Structure 1
Amino acid sequence: KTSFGSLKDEDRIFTNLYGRHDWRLKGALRRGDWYKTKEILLKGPDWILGEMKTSGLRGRGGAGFPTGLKWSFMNKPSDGRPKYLVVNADEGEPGTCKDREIMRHDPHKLVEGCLVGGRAMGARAAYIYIRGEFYNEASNLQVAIREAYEAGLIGKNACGSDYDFDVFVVRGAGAYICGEETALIESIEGKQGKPRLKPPFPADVGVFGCPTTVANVETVAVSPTICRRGGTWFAGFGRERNSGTKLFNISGHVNHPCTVEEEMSVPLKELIEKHAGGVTGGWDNLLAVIPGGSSTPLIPKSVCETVLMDFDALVQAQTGLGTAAVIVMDRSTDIVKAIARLIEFYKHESCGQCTPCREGVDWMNKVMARFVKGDARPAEIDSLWEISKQIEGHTICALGDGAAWPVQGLIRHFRPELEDRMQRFAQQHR
């Protein structure tokens, strides 16, 4: 199929996204969950990993790495140490709400995916590191986990199989950087949320020094339905190498900001006009869009006209598909102030380990504040571009890249706006 979108409700993988249909275990069994899971576990780890590889599911964390290959990193025999699955329920990126929605409205999908992924890797426990601000979501997840333990779906007989698994929930304490892979591992281990270098990879040294695999909530939540319904089906959705369904959050200046499940490779304009009710004032009033959450740069209306919603499509459009969090800005907004607020966010949420990210993102925050006021000079635009290029690729984790990229997008597209602000400031202060 050349065109994508208009996903069928019977093909929606995240039924009960809107809080109906009794999120507890009885409603999960009515909607279809924990079905043939014993058959899946007895079918075994190699079959599950081959199912993931044939489905072609990619990380849904924003990373974009092939889930099947990443999970098949740990198909080794035993070492002496246990193995762990870790789920990232931190969801700290601006624009992103999908993990919160699925944890509070269909948590048994997350629990079943923890069990299936833990069996696929070969493991004894899944630590769900949830965000600290999601107290009600964490309590609902604990209610679901207690119901699964009472039903015998976890612990000493995984759904009647001879596999032993445990599911723990550990809450954060308010750090966006703890959504990172190794920083989350450190936060579980009880230190500060500072990411560690790679190598060693988490598949060799993770939490407590054990082989671990860190996976997104949406990834593990679509995992057991991928195993159950094939994977050729999941690859049938979406384009080549960008396959399946995706939870798009749409926020900002849209008529109905909402979280909706939609097929991959759907047009941005089609997605907004079909699910968000359109831009406030119209598609002509649309100025810019951030398609990923906050780590991805801007795309203006001109390229937003025809862009698709793939990793490859946004890479071609000099952006990325991160958490699929379409932030929409119409013409009646301060785009420089929005980008400066994003740099404020990255300055406040930097963990402070690397000198590049630490000092450079503080520097970016000050330069962007002066850009918003107008008291800069047009040479400082290229100076800020070089500061961004110095930050990017020179840090331990990708928060430095995710702070450099919105600056690069703003400089790339809305440079006459910055120059206009500077000349207006200069002529009004002289």
Structure 2
Amino acid sequence: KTSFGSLKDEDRIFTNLYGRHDWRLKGAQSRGDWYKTKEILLKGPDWILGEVKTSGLRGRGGAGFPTGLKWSFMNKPSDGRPKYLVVNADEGEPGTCKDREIIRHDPHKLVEGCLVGGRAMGARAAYIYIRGEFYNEASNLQVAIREAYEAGLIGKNACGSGYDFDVFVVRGAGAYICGEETALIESIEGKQGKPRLKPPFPADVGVFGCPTTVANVETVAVSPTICRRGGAWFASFGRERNSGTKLFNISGHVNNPCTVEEEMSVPLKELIEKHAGGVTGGWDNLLAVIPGGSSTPLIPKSVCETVLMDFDALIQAQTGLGTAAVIVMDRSTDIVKAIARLIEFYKHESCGQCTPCREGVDWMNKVMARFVRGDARPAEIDSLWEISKQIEGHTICALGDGAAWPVQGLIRHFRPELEERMQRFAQQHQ
């Protein structure tokens, strides 16, 4: 197979993504959920982990780590401590709203995924870290959790298999840095959302010191479908080591911003011209595209023509996949102002525990504000690049790298616009 995309409705993972059907237990069980879960729980954690590993499912959070190996990290005998599975439902990344749609429209799929994942790694219970701002989503999730509890699917003797499994929902308090898995673990324990250092990994010391595995909503809710349809069914899509279907949130200067499921290795041009309704003012009006939300560098029109929206093609285009969040900027935009606002957002969401991010993000904010104003010298632009090289790779967590990447991409792709802006200011003001 060479042409990737044009996914039929028979292969979409998340039916009722648009909320047109019932989201409760009677609606979810009529769409295929909660079917033959007892045999899945009874077959074996080794079989479930092997089926996940053969499927080639990778990280849907944006890190790109393979899910099967990471889930099999905790497949070890216990030392007397309980084991925990935690679902990351914070989703503080700009441009990203797919997990909100999953927790608002398919909560029972998330609960069945929690049960299947907890069976796979022998977890004692499940914790869902919902976002604080998603109050209605959390209420709907807890309604579905109660409806699944009163049906005997979870709890004591879950799904009639003799395996106990408990589920919890914990609300956040408005912090994007709580989306990091170690900062999420620290936030559940009742401290500030300040990340830990690896090693020790969460598979050894996690929440409450117990072995704990943290996984995204989109990589948990697909696990019962992974077990039911089979590994090769998910491996049929995309390129090699890029299998699966992805939710894409397209927003920006676009006629119809929307969330849509598609194949992994679909070209970006086909997706943005088919599902998004096209760039405003035609294709020639397009100026830049950020393919993964605020964590990834942008790419101009010269790279956006024949780019495949998977991990390998995007990492070959000196950017990252991110959370498949397509932010589109046309020619009627102040691009430097947009990157300055992104950097100011990164300044307003940074825990401040470790020094290089805590100082360099503020320094980058001042430099980019002066660049938007234009009050600098041109060589300082190159100096700003060096500041990024003093942040990327010297931080506790990846928020500093996630702030250094868009500045590097903006400089590397639109240095002429920056320098012409500031020399125009220098001419017209001095």
Q: With structure 2 as the length reference, what TM-score do the two structures score?
A: 0.99
Shift of 1:312: 0.7
Q: Name the counterpart of 1:403.
A: 403
Deviation (angstroms), 1:79: 1.1
CA distance in 1, matches of 2:11, 2:126: 28
Structure 1's unaligned 5+ residue stretches are: none
Q: What is the distance in 1 between the residues matched to 2:374 and 2:421?
A: 5
CA deviations 1:371-425 (Å, max 9, x no partner) are 1111011111111101011100000000000000000000110110100111111
Deviation at 1:36, TM superposition (A): 1.0
Q: CA deviation at 1:28?
A: 0.2
- By how many angstroms is 1:239 displaced? 0.9
CA distance in 1, matches of 2:341, 2:41: 47
- Any idea what the Cα deviations from partners look like across 1:34-83, whole Å, max 9, x if unmatched? 11111001011001110111110001001110000000000001111100
Other structure's SS at 1:304 match: coil
Q: CA deviation at 1:15?
A: 0.5
Corresponding residue for residue 216 of structure 1: 216
Q: Aligned ranges for residues 255-334 of structure 1 at < 5 Å?
A: 255-334=255-334
Runs of 4+ in 1 over 4 A off after TM superposition: none
d(CA) in 2 for partners of 1:254 and 1:5?
20
Deviation at 1:179? 0.3
Give a deviation string over 1:321-341, Cα, whole Å, max 9, x none: 111000000011011011011
User: 1:266 and 1:389 mapped to 2: Cα distance?
Assistant: 33
SS in 2 for 1:177: helix
Correspondence for 1:23: 23
Give the deviation of 1:131 after TM superposition: 0.6
Shift of 1:293: 1.3
| Cα distance in 1 for residues equivalent to 2:371 and 2:79 | 55
Deviation of residue 93 (structure 1)?
Answer: 0.2
How big is each residue's C-alpha offset from its partner over 1:237-279, in whole Å with a ceiling of 9 and x where there is no partner? 1111111100000000110000000000110100100100000
For the residue of structure 2 that corresponds to 1:266, the secondary structure is coil
- Once residues 16 and 374 of structure 2 are traced to their aligned partners in structure 1, the CA distance between those partners, rounded to angstroms, is 48
Identity score, percent? 97
Distance, in Å, in 2 between the alignment partners of 1:105 and 1:281 is: 33
User: What's the secondary structure of 1:23's corresponding residue?
Assistant: coil
Distance, in Å, in 1 between the alignment partners of 2:103 and 2:238 is 24
1:84-138 deviations in Å (ceiling 9; x for gaps)? 0000000000000000001000010100000000110101111000110000000
Length, aligned pairs only: 430
Alpha-carbon offset, residue 29 of structure 1: 0.4
| In 1, Cα distance between equivalents of 2:398 and 2:115 | 29
Measured in 1, the distance between the counterparts of 2:376 and 2:71 equals 48
Offset, 1:156: 1.1
Relative to the length of structure 1, the TM-score reads 0.99
Q: 2:108 matched to which residue of 1?
A: 108
For residues 166 and 404 of structure 2, what CA distance do their matches in structure 1 show?
39
- Residues of 2 paired with 1:45 and 1:342: CA distance? 43
Secondary structure class of the residue paired with 1:79: coil
Deviation at 1:291, TM superposition (A): 0.3
Distance in 1, Cα, partners of 2:71 & 2:62 = 16
Rounded Cα–Cα distance in structure 2 between residues aligned with 1:145 and 1:101: 17
Q: Which moved more, 1:193-202 or 1:376-385?
A: 376-385
Task: After superposition, give the CA deviation of every residue in 1:297-328 in whole Å (9 maximum; x if it has no partner).
Answer: 01001100000101111000111111100000
| CA-based RMSD | 0.6
Query: Which stretch of the first structure deviates more once superposed, 211-220 or 375-384?
Result: 375-384
2:321 & 2:303 partners in 1: Cα distance? 15
Shift of 1:157: 1.1
Q: Which runs of 5+ in 2 are unaligned?
A: none
Structure 2 distance, partners of 1:100, 1:139, is: 13
Structure 2 residue aligned with 1:81: 81
2 CA distance for matches of 1:96 and 1:223?
21
